[PDB]
Design a protein around this ligand. Structure first.
Ligand SMILES: [Mg+2]
Ligand SMILES: [Zn+2]
Ligand SMILES: [Zn+2]
Lengths: 83, 103, 1335
DNA sequence: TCATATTATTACGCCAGACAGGG
DNA sequence: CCCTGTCTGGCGTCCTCTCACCTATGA
RNA sequence: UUGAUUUGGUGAGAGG
């Protein structure tokens, strides 16, 4: 559940970047393909995003690392499927 | 139950692309000037962007948004408000050459 | 997608390139059928087909050939919205000059062709002729010609001679006007003249002459040749309910211009005579000028009935144009509105929202959910399901609500706490249930209020509603540090009745093993809620580094304090509940909980406070009766003693012993004294009326009277209201402004009779009229403030400076009003504060001063802190993060991005409603004396008299801080001296303001220099005393033969030689001013401190006159340069004053209006920032004389005095940043090696980055001068014309921007609210960082 | 029905900004 | 020629709800 | 491809 986002503001200390990081993550869960890193208590993708932020496993650096890993996986998939 | 009113989507005016006003006309709430200043006072840049582009005026934005909501994709494709292009044609209909510059 | 918006003039080639066809015929439509007109205003070929992909007449009724245009239709083939973007053009037969460039004040064609507006209009309305390159005749180029002047010239210069009229002639003049040539001439003219007026008249003409050459704007583009017509879709022709078409006003305007243009083409075909085509072209000129901006010419045209019809400029300007009505504020889908109600079961992050509104606002989410499950197929099926409202869509609705916030909004939103985001809880009902604490943020009572709900659609908006705008996140008001979720009215009564005590109850003095059995003894019926009792409580004090240490003890407390201790979180000490808990105490309870335990315990503890307050206020049964308002038994004898006193005064009035004004003053004084005595009688009779015994004799206590707990708790009520319900209700005042001598001796529990209620209605009708007219000025003040701010975004982290204003505590002359901890709380210091002992680094030089630092400042008794202010910030285009300060609603520093101009403007203008609209020095405390700005001398008796007017008398305590301050005049009798210790209440100063002392420095004999009785001075021997005095005349009463004679007194020795000033070689002569009377006559030896002559003599519009920076009517005059001073010419309009500096150059002077009582003598040396007369002082003089920090201290003190007189807490950051936005423009003094001009006004960030990129080179920079513009002149003088056009007058700003060819690099908040994109402040600051990086 | 085209009331209160007048 | 009355323009609060009323002419 | 007119504008009154 969710009442305040205060710990998520503590771990991403800008309070304006929290919205952007959790929005990037909640778009990775909504359309999205991806599955959450945290157990869901029938919370929506907003609260699951912020709840991932509070326990310190999603920030901007982890999302860019995962997207570089997916870009390398697509690169290796294209190279190993064609050649 | 003469004051309770709500609007998701219905009819709008002619000149402008924004929703009509009132209850007898099935219309939405005027999100006035001081509410825009109150959203600027927070960091509500995306809430204000859908509050004046998708929810109100931009016709391509609101049809894409209705289809995006009912697909299950909360995402806005904003574009430019229609009443600002109405402003451009009313200013341009003077002897004034107002434009929109480089990419 | 696109950068800046460019505005320029419209060439006739550009207007033909916009166009799609010439609009000929004025015929609108057929009107008997449905078809339009071919080819009239609403054409087919010129614009497009009414129907989508259809020839209106007949061909193409499918989707194959989109474009073909047959001869039978003369129609394009595209979309229904294609006509909204397409515009037509009217080939104006006769040229017509634009009204926006002919009447803009100043006119664009008025200061360009060097011709007066009057003469320009004469020729323009076919009433005067104008010459154009005549030839070899005796006539100028600008000189005009009349009928008689032309007739004679016609017969004279019949050959080479040109003299046309109207726009045609004007056009030629502009067309044949070598811009470049004029530049040099004008520039050379400005450098070959000294005329002040001319200089300004030449610099304003050359500025608009070189600006036209810088852009691609031609001089012949001012006159309209190819008038453009607005798209039909934008001038819609819809019928109302009936059979007629309600036509717009622009169709009347365009149809008249086309009717007249067709008539003028036909008359130029037929070769009508001169006067016919002059009237025809003049009617076309007036028709075009009425179309563009109606009513700027003489009385505006009208269709139905006498009301004028609305033109294009009236579609732009005004409160109902496009900016203020459709681009800044829009009507909004997914929105709702209903009446609010309480619902106190809520947690403060959630609100109640009805099921009917919830099913209407969330129709697309329900459609998406229904389509996901598989219950239905097509969208229609889902719309039938929710139109029928079956049994399965309510589970769908509870599954779309759950974690989806909504924006509740009360309709007059003044500050940012009036839009807050909640989570819905569904309500059987039709009323929004709103959590009560949150009401004190919205200013929402429940007397019929309404609120709007808005739905954040996208995912970033749901996250902004949860992470920025959630109601748990707004628990501190952004104007200050005070909590805004303070418990308002019922809950403080429940607490004040709960945590209190009485001297005997059930369970007096029994001992309890915990708070749990305290509540168990209250519930079972064995003790009372207020019964004093030793309990054993375990308070957790967190004295280690983040570790909570338990200490358990026995507190002598009550039952209610233990029950309320069951709700307090762990870290707070027990002494927060040990007192009686009014409203100030519960506010600081929540404030100490927020400062210690953070946010989440403070949210859950605010809810538990509200729940236990409501529950024990329900258990209290705290009614109000008729017996609760206890009448004083002493009230009638007080009224009879006052009646005996007014009887004595009127018996003196019958015998004429006293005057009438002294009678009125004595009656108002005794009724004020009797009113205070009646209030003290009732206040004793209420505050300690209960007297109950305990085990023996009686003992008194504070009362449990109901109206007294409603007053003492601070729930609702004060001293004045409870005074008017029991004691007499004062002396009400008539609308003349003066008070009424017969008061209203009857309260409300006794009956008012008729006259007393009528006087009461005077006093209350004035208050209702004041609020209902005050609110307009309060709202317009908030508008001007958020449009001068509008741009200022926290955009750095350190500006890298060492300058900042000097925060001292403010002291008016009473006790120290606002302590230093209120002013330097959460503001980052400029240099490191020295500890008051000696040279210690107490705090470092860039530390935020939160509460722990401010307590270590209060322990050391720190004098004053040099702290960083927003007006000293060195950041170009924004404010750095340290020079702002603390976040104010967040504990930390301001984040990179958060818009501080808008929250500051709202925080100053939001208390605009609460504000109103319409001898010697006696010390109070006991301390040490200190003097500043002092040059003094010891008199003969010993009292240190002062030879300086501007001396500040401070009372410093034994610790080092400054506790008192006063202003002591020139020549006062100080009972004390420098550095001395006094007693509390001892008089330390004395003077006579009705007698300006002309006291000396040295001793000697007195001579009358230039003092001749008969012309200079006069003989007026005193009547009632006999001790005469030679009365000095002024320079106006004596005649012109002796007016040049200046009477004076110069002190000599026993021989006659001039005793010199100690330090110089100049004698001490004192020139006597006008209206003086000589006290000490000739031959009398003098000393210091003895006179040489007798010289006899605000609420809200104050806030407006400080921010708008008006001048007062009689300003205090100052000196622009230091040095010696003297007088001048005898009364030619004014009386001169010449200042010659000691080392600096002489030629500055000023002609003082001689109606002022001056301060300076002839032998006085002045300084910049030193006063010459007295009264109010304009801020421009502060800015150009003392400094920037002086004017920002002046505005923040002169407006915190209004906000403190009315009792509103606002931090000074907001006034410092609106002061920054006032003085943002500057003027050049020395142009230097840059590209500027001499007296050009340029904005400060521009000139600073210019000479900072030139000074980093070898070249030395440009030296500016700052100027203070008032807020509406400063927001209309911006480098962004949309920012200055969404605000006041759009005509002036759009013509200035058009003829300058101005460009709007958007870069602010309101340009991006207009153009429809992300704000460059909040969440969008990362987006604008990205876009500014990727260029 | 289908072109023809504009006249006999006053009663705000500052507050800047530009303009002819005169010592 | 620098003060100066005098005249002309340009402001004047947001949100909402109910009702009625809408150019004359004319061979 | 499955449907339609107030906003426009005035005046008066009301709510917070
Ligand atoms: Mg109310
Ligand atoms: Zn066709
Ligand atoms: Zn700074």
């Amino acid at each position: 559940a969710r009442v305040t986002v205060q710990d998520a503001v503590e771990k991403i200390g800008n309070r304006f970047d929290l919205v952007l990081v959790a929005a990037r993550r909640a778009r990775q869960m909504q359309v999205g393909g991806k599955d959450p890193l945290v157990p869901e208590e029938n919370d929506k993708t907003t609260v699951i995003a912020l709840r991932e932020i509070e326990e310190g496993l999603i920030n901007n650096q982890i999302l860019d690392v995962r997207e570089r890993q997916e870009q390398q996986e697509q690169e290796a998939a294209e190279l190993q499927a064609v050649t | 139950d003469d004051k309770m009113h709500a609007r998701s989507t219905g009819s709008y005016s002619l000149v402008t692309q924004q929703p009509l006003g009132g209850k007898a006309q099935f219309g939405g709430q005027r999100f006035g000037e001081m509410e825009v200043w109150a959203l600027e006072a927070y960091g509500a840049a995306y809430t204000l962007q859908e509050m004046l582009t998708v929810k109100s005026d931009d016709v391509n934005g609101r049809t894409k948004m209705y289809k995006n909501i009912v697909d299950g994709n909360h995402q806005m494709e904003p574009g430019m408000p229609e009443s600002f292009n109405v402003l451009l044609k009313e200013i341009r209909s003077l002897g004034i050459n107002i434009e929109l510059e480089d990419e | 997608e696109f950068d800046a918006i460019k505005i320029a003039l419209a060439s006739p080639d550009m207007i033909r390139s916009w166009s799609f066809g010439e609009v000929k015929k004025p015929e609108t439509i057929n009107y008997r059928t449905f078809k339009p007109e071919r080819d009239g205003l609403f054409c087919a070929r010129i614009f497009g087909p009414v129907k989508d992909y259809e020839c209106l007449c007949g061909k193409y009724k499918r989707l194959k050939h989109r474009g073909v245009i047959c001869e039978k239709c003369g129609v394009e083939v595209t979309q229904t919205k294609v006509r909204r973007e397409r515009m037509g053009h009217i080939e104006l037969a006769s040229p017509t000059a634009h009204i926006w460039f002919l009447k803009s004040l100043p006119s664009r064609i008025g200061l360009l062709l060097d011709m007066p507006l009057r003469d320009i209009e004469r020729v323009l309305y076919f009433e005067s002729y104008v010459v154009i390159e005549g030839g070899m005749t005796n006539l100028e180029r600008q000189q005009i010609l009349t009928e008689e002047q032309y007739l004679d010239a016609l017969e004279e210069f019949g050959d080479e001679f040109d003299a046309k009229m109207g726009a045609e002639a004007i056009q030629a003049l502009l067309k044949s006007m070598d811009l470049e040539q004029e530049c040099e001439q004008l520039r050379e003219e400005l450098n070959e003249t000294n005329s002040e007026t001319k200089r300004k008249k030449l610099t304003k003409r050359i500025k608009l002459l070189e600006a036209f050459v810088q852009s691609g704007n031609k001089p012949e583009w001012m006159i309209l040749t190819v008038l453009p017509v607005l798209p039909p879709d934008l001038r819609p022709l819809v019928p109302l309910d009936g059979g007629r078409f309600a036509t717009s006003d622009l169709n009347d305007l365009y149809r008249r211009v086309i009717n007249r243009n067709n008539r003028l083409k036909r008359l130029l075909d037929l070769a009508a005579p001169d006067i016919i085509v002059r009237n025809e072209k003049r009617m076309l000129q007036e028709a075009v000028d009425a179309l563009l901006d109606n009513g700027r010419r003489g009385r505006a045209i009208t269709g139905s009935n006498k009301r004028p019809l609305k033109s294009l400029a009236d579609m732009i300007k005004g409160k109902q144009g496009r900016f203020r009505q459709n681009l800044l504020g829009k009507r909004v889908d997914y929105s709702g509105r209903s009446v609010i109600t309480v619902g106190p079961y809520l947690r403060l992050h959630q609100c109640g929202l009805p099921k009917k509104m919830a099913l209407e606002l969330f129709k697309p989410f329900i459609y998406g959910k229904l389509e996901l499950r598989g219950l239905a197929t097509t969208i229609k099926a889902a719309k039938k399901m929710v139109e029928r409202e079956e049994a399965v869509v309510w589970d769908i609705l509870d599954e779309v609500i759950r974690e989806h916030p909504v924006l509740l909004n009360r309709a007059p939103t003044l500050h940012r706490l009036g839009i807050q985001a909640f989570e819905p809880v569904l309500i059987e009902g039709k009323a929004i249930q709103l959590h009560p604490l949150v009401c004190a943020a919205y200013n929402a009572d429940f007397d019929g209020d309404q609120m709007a709900v808005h739905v954040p659609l996208t995912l970033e908006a749901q996250l902004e509603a949860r992470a920025l705008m959630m109601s748990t996140n707004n628990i501190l008001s952004p104007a200050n540090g005070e909590p805004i979720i303070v418990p308002s009215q019922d809950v403080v009564l429940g607490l004040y009745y709960m945590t209190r005590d009485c001297v005997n109850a059930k369970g007096e003095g029994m001992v309890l093993t915990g708070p749990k059995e305290a509540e168990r003894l209250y519930r079972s019926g064995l003790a009372s809620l207020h019964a004093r009792v030793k309990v054993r409580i375990t308070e957790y004090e967190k004295d280690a580094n983040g570790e909570l240490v338990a200490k358990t003890s026995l507190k002598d407390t009550t039952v209610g304090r233990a029950i309320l201790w069951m709700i307090v979180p762990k870290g707070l000490p027990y002494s927060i509940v040990n007192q009686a808990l009014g409203k100030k105490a519960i506010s600081k309870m929540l404030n100490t909980c927020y400062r210690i335990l953070g946010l989440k315990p403070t949210v859950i503890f605010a809810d538990q406070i509200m729940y236990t307050g409501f529950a024990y206020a329900a258990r209290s049964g705290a009614s109000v009766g008729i017996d609760d308002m206890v009448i004083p038994e002493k009230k009638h004898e007080i009224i009879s003693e006052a009646e005996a006193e007014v009887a004595e005064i009127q018996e003196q009035f019958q015998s004429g012993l006293v005057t009438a004004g002294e009678r009125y003053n004595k009656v108002i004084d005794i009724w004020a004294a009797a009113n205070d005595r009646v209030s003290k009688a009732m206040m004793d009779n209420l505050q300690t009326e209960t007297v109950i015994n305990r085990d023996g004799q009686e003992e008194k206590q504070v009362s449990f009277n109901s109206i007294y707990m409603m007053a003492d708790s601070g729930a609702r009520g004060s001293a004045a209201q409870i005074r008017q319900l029991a004691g007499m209700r004062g002396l009400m005042a008539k609308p003349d402004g003066s008070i009424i001598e017969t008061p209203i001796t009857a309260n409300f529990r006794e009956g008012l009779n008729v006259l007393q209620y009528f006087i009461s209605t005077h006093g209350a009708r004035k208050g209702l009229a004041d609020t209902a007219l005050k609110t307009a000025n309060s709202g317009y003040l908030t508008r001007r403030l958020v449009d001068v701010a509008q741009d200022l975004v926290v955009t750095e982290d350190d500006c890298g400076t060492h300058e900042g204003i000097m925060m001292t505590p403010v002291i008016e002359g009473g006790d120290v009003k606002e302590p230093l901890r209120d002013r330097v709380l959460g503001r980052v210091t400029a240099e490191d504060v020295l500890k008051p002992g000696t040279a210690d680094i107490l705090v470092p030089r860039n530390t935020l001063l939160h509460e722990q630092w401010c307590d270590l400042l209060e322990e050391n008794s720190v004098d004053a802190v040099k702290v960083r202010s927003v007006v000293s910030c060195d950041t170009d285009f924004g404010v750095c993060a340290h020079c702002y300060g603390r976040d104010l609603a967040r504990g930390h520093i301001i984040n990179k991005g958060e818009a501080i101009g808008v929250i500051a403007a709202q925080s100053i203008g939001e208390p605009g409603t609460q504000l109103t609209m319409r001898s010697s020095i006696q010390v109070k405390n006991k301390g040490s004396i200190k003097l500043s700005n002092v040059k003094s001398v010891v008199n003969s008796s010993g009292k240190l008299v002062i030879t300086s007017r501007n001396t500040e008398l401070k009372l410093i305590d034994e610790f080092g801080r400054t506790k008192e301050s006063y202003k002591v005049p020139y020549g006062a009798v100080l009972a004390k001296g420098d550095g001395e210790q006094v007693a509390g209440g001892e008089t330390v100063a004395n003077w006579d303001p009705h007698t300006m002392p002309v006291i000396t420095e040295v001793s000697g004999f007195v001579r009358f220099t230039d003092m001749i009785d008969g012309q200079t001075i006069t003989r007026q021997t005193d009547e009632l005393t006999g001790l005469s005095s030679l009365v000095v005349l002024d320079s106006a009463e004596r005649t012109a033969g002796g007016k040049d004679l200046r009477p004076a007194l110069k002190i000599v020795d026993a021989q006659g030689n001039d005793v010199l000033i100690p330090g110089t070689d100049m004698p001490a002569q004192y020139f006597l001013p006008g209206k003086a009377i000589v006290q000490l006559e000739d031959g009398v030896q003098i000393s210091s401190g003895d006179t040489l002559a007798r010289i006899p003599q605000g609420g809200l519009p104050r806030v407006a006159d400080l921010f708008e920076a008006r001048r007062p009517k009689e300003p205090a005059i100052l000196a622009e340069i230091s040095g010696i001073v003297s007088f001048g010419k005898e009364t030619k309009g004014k009386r001169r004053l010449v200042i010659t500096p000691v080392d600096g150059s002489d030629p500055y002077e000023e002609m003082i209006p001689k109606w002022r009582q001056l301060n300076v003598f002839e032998g006085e040396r002045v300084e910049r920032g030193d006063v010459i007369s007295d009264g109010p002082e304009a801020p421009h003089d502060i800015l150009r004389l003392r400094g920037v920090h002086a004017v920002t201290r002046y505005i923040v003190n002169e407006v915190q005095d209004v906000y403190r007189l009315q009792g509103v807490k606002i931090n000074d950051k907001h006034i410092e940043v609106i002061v920054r936005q006032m003085l943002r423009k500057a003027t050049i003094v020395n142009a230097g090696s840059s590209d500027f001009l001499e007296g050009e006004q340029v904005e400060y960030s521009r000139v600073k980055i210019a000479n900072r990129e030139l000074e980093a080179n070898g070249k030395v920079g440009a030296t500016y001068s700052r100027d203070l513009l008032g807020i509406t002149k400063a927001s209309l003088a911006t480098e962004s014309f949309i920012s200055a056009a969404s605000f006041q007058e759009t005509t002036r700003v759009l013509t200035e921007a058009a003829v300058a060819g101005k460009r709007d690099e958007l870069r602010g908040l309101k340009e991006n609210v207009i153009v429809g994109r992300l704000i460059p402040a909040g969440t969008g600051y990362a987006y604008h960082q990205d876009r500014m990086r990727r260029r």
